[PDB]
Write a structure and sequence with these properties.
The protein is of the alpha+beta class. The chain has two domains: about 1-130, no CATH class; about 135-260, no CATH class. It has seven helices and ten strands. The protein has helices at about 5-15, 140-150, 160-165, 175-185, 195-200, 205-220, 230-240; strands at about 20-30, 40-50, 55-60, 70-75, 80-90, 95-100, 110-115, 120-125, 250, 255-260. The strands form two sheets. An eight-stranded antiparallel sheet has the order 5-7-6-1-2-3-4-8. It has a two-stranded antiparallel ribbon with strand order 9-10. Strand 6 and strand 7 form a beta hairpin. The longest helix is centred in the last third of the chain and has 15 residues, at about 205-220. The radius of gyration is 20 Å and the shape is elongated. It binds a DNA duplex through loops. It is found in: Cytoplasm, Cytoskeleton, Microtubule organizing center, Centrosome; Nucleus; Chromosome. GO terms for molecular function: class I DNA-(apurinic or apyrimidinic site) endonuclease activity; damaged DNA binding; DNA N-glycosylase activity; DNA-(apurinic or apyrimidinic site) endonuclease activity; hydrolase activity, acting on glycosyl bonds; zinc ion binding. It catalyses: 2'-deoxyribonucleotide-(2'-deoxyribose 5'-phosphate)-2'-deoxyribonucleotide-DNA = a 3'-end 2'-deoxyribonucleotide-(2,3-dehydro-2,3-deoxyribose 5'-phosphate)-DNA + a 5'-end 5'-phospho-2'-deoxyribonucleoside-DNA + H(+). Its EC number is 3.2.2.-, 4.2.99.18.
DNA sequence: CGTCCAGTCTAC
DNA sequence: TAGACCTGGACGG
């Protein structure tokens, strides 16, 4: 996911788990190289927040739950295919690598971290990844300032399309978003990043917030009340640039495809 | 059958 | 920097 997907995933955990109690251990699949979660409680609640391209779960035992335990926080990065599903315990999807089991009474469910390609990670601290800048959705002013006060950084020597994937400065922006942001302003993707940002000290940094916010406001992205194909219709409709007919595409220097209209820009391959 | 395509992370 | 990390779906032969 990108920032929107991580944000909706955290909203899904919050609404779906609002009225559930979990019990027992946190089960990791055998094949996952991520760490075992050392956590057990007779009764705990699960809640979530997103920052950029990370999601933090908090495991919160109820009063008197046993064995005595403090709340535990886990931070997830989703990679290409990470997600959360709430499923009936004996219909686990394939590639459910981390499971949280509801406690009785009621229908026995599992909250699953599901990750086909296993690019996703999680860590035992609750800490956000040091080096990631502020969330473009939830920390706009901090995000904007952190870019504008570090324009000398060699990160801004690169093309604007490459700079926009640098999670030190645009935590939450990924490949579809960089195409959608740059198309809204018709900024050539291979313009020098420092050139587009010096010109700023509704601009590019504001759309780094408002464009991803639009996706959040659509809802869906796997987390909606509407069907899987229904939310996917709404998203494909909203996209104006990414993989759309009549648009150009090039490989950036890490081989990631950038979609654009018109002038590729000066630093183009 | 085969190829190609869809965000870090780490060893050069 | 360039390759590694993975699975599956679309498409070509």
């Amino acid at each position: 996911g990108q920032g929107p997907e991580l944000h909706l995933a955290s909203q899904f955990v919050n609404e779906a788990c609002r009225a559930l109690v979990f019990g027992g251990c946190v089960e990791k699949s055998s094949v996952s190289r991520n760490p075992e979660v050392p956590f057990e409680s007779s009764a705990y609640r699960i809640s979530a927040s997103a920052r950029g391209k990370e999601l933090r779960l908090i495991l919160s035992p109820l009063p008197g739950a046993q064995p005595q335990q403090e709340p535990l926080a886990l931070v997830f990065r989703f990679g290409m295919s990470g997600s959360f599903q709430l499923v009936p315990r004996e219909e686990l999807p394939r590639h459910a690598h981390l499971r949280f089991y509801t406690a009785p009474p009621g229908p026995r469910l599992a909250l699953c971290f599901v990750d086909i390609r296993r690019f996703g990670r999680w860590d035992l601290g609750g800490k956000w990844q040091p080096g990631r800048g502020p969330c473009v959705l939830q920390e706009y002013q901090q995000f904007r300032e952190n870019v504008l006060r570090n324009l000398a950084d060699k990160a801004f020597d690169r093309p604007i399309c490459e700079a926009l994937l640098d999670q030190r400065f645009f935590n939450g922006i990924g490949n579809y978003l960089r195409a959608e942001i740059l198309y809204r302003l018709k900024i050539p993707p291979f313009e020098k990043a420092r050139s587009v940002l010096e010109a700023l000290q509704p601009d590019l940094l504001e759309l780094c917030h408002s464009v991803p916010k639009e996706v959040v406001q659509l809802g869906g992205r796997g987390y909606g009340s509407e069907s899987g194909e229904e939310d996917f219709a709404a998203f494909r409709a909203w996209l104006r640039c990414y993989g759309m007919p009549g648009m150009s595409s090039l490989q950036d220097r890490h081989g990631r495809t950038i979609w654009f209209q018109g002038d590729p820009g000066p630093l183009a391959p």
